[PDB]
Design an enzyme around this catalytic site. Sequence first.
Site, PDB file in Angstrom:
ATOM      1  N   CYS A  20      30.526  24.696  46.341  1.00  0.00           N
ATOM      2  CA  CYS A  20      30.303  24.812  44.905  1.00  0.00           C
ATOM      3  C   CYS A  20      29.354  26.003  44.759  1.00  0.00           C
ATOM      4  O   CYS A  20      29.538  27.009  45.454  1.00  0.00           O
ATOM      5  CB  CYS A  20      29.762  23.513  44.313  1.00  0.00           C
ATOM      6  SG  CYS A  20      28.531  22.698  45.367  1.00  0.00           S
ATOM      7  N   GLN A  59      23.831  15.711  43.640  1.00  0.00           N
ATOM      8  CA  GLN A  59      22.607  16.229  43.050  1.00  0.00           C
ATOM      9  C   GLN A  59      22.126  15.462  41.813  1.00  0.00           C
ATOM     10  O   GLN A  59      21.000  15.699  41.382  1.00  0.00           O
ATOM     11  CB  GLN A  59      22.803  17.705  42.690  1.00  0.00           C
ATOM     12  CG  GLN A  59      22.606  18.593  43.888  1.00  0.00           C
ATOM     13  CD  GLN A  59      21.136  18.684  44.254  1.00  0.00           C
ATOM     14  OE1 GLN A  59      20.390  19.354  43.573  1.00  0.00           O
ATOM     15  NE2 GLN A  59      20.720  17.994  45.320  1.00  0.00           N
ATOM     16  N   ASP A  98      28.729  22.644  36.504  1.00  0.00           N
ATOM     17  CA  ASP A  98      27.583  22.594  37.407  1.00  0.00           C
ATOM     18  C   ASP A  98      26.603  21.517  36.949  1.00  0.00           C
ATOM     19  O   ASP A  98      26.329  21.370  35.751  1.00  0.00           O
ATOM     20  CB  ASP A  98      26.886  23.951  37.482  1.00  0.00           C
ATOM     21  CG  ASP A  98      25.951  24.070  38.695  1.00  0.00           C
ATOM     22  OD1 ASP A  98      25.755  23.085  39.477  1.00  0.00           O
ATOM     23  OD2 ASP A  98      25.409  25.173  38.868  1.00  0.00           O
ATOM     24  N   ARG A 145      28.397  19.231  43.666  1.00  0.00           N
ATOM     25  CA  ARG A 145      29.830  18.963  43.554  1.00  0.00           C
ATOM     26  C   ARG A 145      30.491  18.826  44.930  1.00  0.00           C
ATOM     27  O   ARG A 145      31.351  17.960  45.130  1.00  0.00           O
ATOM     28  CB  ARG A 145      30.485  20.081  42.723  1.00  0.00           C
ATOM     29  CG  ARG A 145      30.034  19.989  41.233  1.00  0.00           C
ATOM     30  CD  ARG A 145      30.418  21.232  40.395  1.00  0.00           C
ATOM     31  NE  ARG A 145      29.527  22.367  40.681  1.00  0.00           N
ATOM     32  CZ  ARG A 145      29.569  23.538  40.049  1.00  0.00           C
ATOM     33  NH1 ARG A 145      30.468  23.738  39.084  1.00  0.00           N
ATOM     34  NH2 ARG A 145      28.704  24.498  40.368  1.00  0.00           N
ATOM     35  N   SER A 146      30.109  19.676  45.887  1.00  0.00           N
ATOM     36  CA  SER A 146      30.674  19.582  47.226  1.00  0.00           C
ATOM     37  C   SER A 146      30.402  18.215  47.836  1.00  0.00           C
ATOM     38  O   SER A 146      31.293  17.623  48.455  1.00  0.00           O
ATOM     39  CB  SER A 146      30.110  20.686  48.120  1.00  0.00           C
ATOM     40  OG  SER A 146      30.495  21.967  47.664  1.00  0.00           O
TER      41      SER A 146
HETATM   42  O1  OTA Z   1      27.060  23.840  42.397  1.00  0.00           O
HETATM   43  C1  OTA Z   1      26.659  22.672  42.585  1.00  0.00           C
HETATM   44  O2  OTA Z   1      27.348  21.629  42.309  1.00  0.00           O
HETATM   45  C2  OTA Z   1      25.237  22.493  43.057  1.00  0.00           C
HETATM   46  O3  OTA Z   1      24.892  21.610  43.866  1.00  0.00           O
HETATM   47  N1  OTA Z   1      24.346  23.391  42.471  1.00  0.00           N
HETATM   48  C3  OTA Z   1      22.958  23.426  42.747  1.00  0.00           C
HETATM   49  S1  OTA Z   1      22.038  22.534  43.673  1.00  0.00           S
HETATM   50  C4  OTA Z   1      20.623  23.226  43.451  1.00  0.00           C
HETATM   51  C5  OTA Z   1      20.717  24.302  42.517  1.00  0.00           C
HETATM   52  C6  OTA Z   1      22.216  24.418  42.081  1.00  0.00           C
HETATM   53  C7  OTA Z   1      22.776  25.458  41.058  1.00  0.00           C
HETATM   54  O4  OTA Z   1      24.051  25.688  41.031  1.00  0.00           O
HETATM   55  O5  OTA Z   1      21.990  26.050  40.265  1.00  0.00           O
HETATM   56  C8  OTA Z   1      19.554  25.135  42.104  1.00  0.00           C
HETATM   57  C9  OTA Z   1      18.335  24.974  42.910  1.00  0.00           C
HETATM   58  N2  OTA Z   1      18.103  23.584  43.291  1.00  0.00           N
HETATM   59  C10 OTA Z   1      19.217  22.949  43.982  1.00  0.00           C
HETATM   60 CL    CL Z   2      18.505  15.557  46.665  1.00  0.00          CL
END
Ligand code: OTA
Ligand code: CL
EC number: 3.1.3.48
Length: 298
Positions: free
Chosen positions: A216, A263, A182, A222-223
């Site tokens: 994800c 992200q 993650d 990841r998606s």
């Molecule tokens: O699983 C991913 O690749 C992903 O985008 N995760 C994300 S995006 C995102 C979070 C998370 C997380 O898993 O904590 C937490 C809150 N802010 C945005």
């Molecule tokens: Cl963003």
Amino acid sequence: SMEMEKEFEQIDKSGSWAAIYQDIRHEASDFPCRVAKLPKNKNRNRYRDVSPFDHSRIKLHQEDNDYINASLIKMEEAQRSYILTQGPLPNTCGHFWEMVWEQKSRGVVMLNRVMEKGSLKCAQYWPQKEEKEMIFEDTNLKLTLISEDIKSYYTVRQLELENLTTQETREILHFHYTAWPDFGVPESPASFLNFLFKVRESGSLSPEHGPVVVHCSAGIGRSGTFCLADTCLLLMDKRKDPSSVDIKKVLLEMRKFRMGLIQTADQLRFSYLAVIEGAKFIMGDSSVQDQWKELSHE
Ligand SMILES: O=C(O)C(=O)Nc1sc2c(c1C(=O)O)CCNC2
Ligand SMILES: [Cl-]
Ligand SMILES: [Cl-]
Ligand SMILES: [Cl-]
Ligand SMILES: [Cl-]
Ligand SMILES: [Cl-]
């Protein structure tokens, strides 16, 4: 050699991945997410800052509450669609499989693990043992593990999904990338590409099927990396022309349909690497697919 390679080297030399990535965040679309923010949907969302736009959200075919945190990413020029969704919650696994049914998806791509960094990032939404099938009473679906093929950094499962109302059954393919942290990147472009081409080879991305479901934990980081690489490789493939593919423009187009796709700046950097390396296969060197399978240590 390729124009994206030249750009990649220039961005690496000047250390400006963070600034390039922030420009994308600044220019990205902003559309309303009013349905997602309705008080009755509070417990259908995993993260309060990750919501589907109203204009692209998948509606459940339910008269009660049609909301799921899921977006249709419709890539018009590439002519491929994806459904990006969050990892289902304990109360939304029935909605999730209802969406797979209603949308006629053939595959589910899962890029996270159920537990990551000591937290539950996703509910256990599929059965782990053949003899322990799952019944989702709210949406009247039955889900059975048929078989699974576990490799070192991904697992493929064959699932049977049955509409208990009509007794129709469908085979769903579950493609589970198990070695992608993650907020992290895959361990190599090679292992990422080996996985992507397994999904491709299964037929699950064919236009004869509903859109593949990709998730994800949030359905964006990841998606988004996975879908950006696939669409860029597809566009290059359609035109057999690497130079016609502007990766940042493609990511901005995708972000018209769901917020926050990709992200971190390193995920952006990684998706350049995946597209540049995948390009070798697209442009006629099929032996690189064999190198991926070997270098990835399946
Ligand atoms: O699983 C991913 O690749 C992903 O985008 N995760 C994300 S995006 C995102 C979070 C998370 C997380 O898993 O904590 C937490 C809150 N802010 C945005
Ligand atoms: Cl963003
Ligand atoms: Cl409400
Ligand atoms: Cl898992
Ligand atoms: Cl852990
Ligand atoms: Cl959960």
